[PDB]
Amino acid sequence: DYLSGGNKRIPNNVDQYFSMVAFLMVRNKDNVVIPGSTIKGMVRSRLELSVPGS
C-alpha cells in the first residue's frame, strides 16, 4: 500500500491468510510433523519406567 502511506487501515494480513496468532506446531513444508526427538524421549521414558534394571 505505497509503503503504507499514512493509511494503516486495511485488514491486509488478517484476511490474506487463515492463521491467527497461536502456538505453532512444528511442521515441514506445510506438513505437520511430530519431532523424532520427542518420540525418542517418550520411548526412553517408557523404557526407563518399565524395565526393572534400568
Add this chain to the structure above:
RNA sequence: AUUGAAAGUUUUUUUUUUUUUUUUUUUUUUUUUUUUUUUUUUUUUUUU
C-alpha cells in the same frame, strides 16, 4: 848487527734500469609437503 835500509798495492766507482701472475670459467641438473580421520553421541517445547 844479513851487501842493507824504508816505504799499506793503496786509493776512487750503489749490480742499477725496463715488466700488474694476467685472460677466459653462472656451485647447477633433477624431486607435487602428501597420506589414512563423518564436527560425532547424550536431551519429549515444555506444568499448579
